[PDB]
Structure 1
Amino acid sequence: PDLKNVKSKIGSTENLKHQPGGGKVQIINKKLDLSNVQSKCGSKDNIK
């Protein structure tokens, strides 16, 4: 009558390494350039 300790069929065997982990995000942006500036509403020559 000894069955020889029969094993299960068929399980979550494909999940045994699984968690799963998460990816990443980082946003974060670049500064625009506003260095092209000069005023016009005054005098630079006729002041002299």
Structure 2
Amino acid sequence: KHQPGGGKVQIINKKLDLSNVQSKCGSKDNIKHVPGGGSVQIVYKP
């Protein structure tokens, strides 16, 4: 919606973006894509 930088202008990326749900730079719990510094768990950057 606003992720494109303005509802009036759409970069189509909106579909990729969750939108307001995204809030944080990533999804909930950092998309749990933790590569290492994120929390060192999966340690396999998705």
TM-score calculated relative to the size of structure 2: 0.17
Larger Rg over CA atoms? 1
* Larger relative contact order, structure 1 or 2 (CA cutoff 8 Å, min sep 6): 2
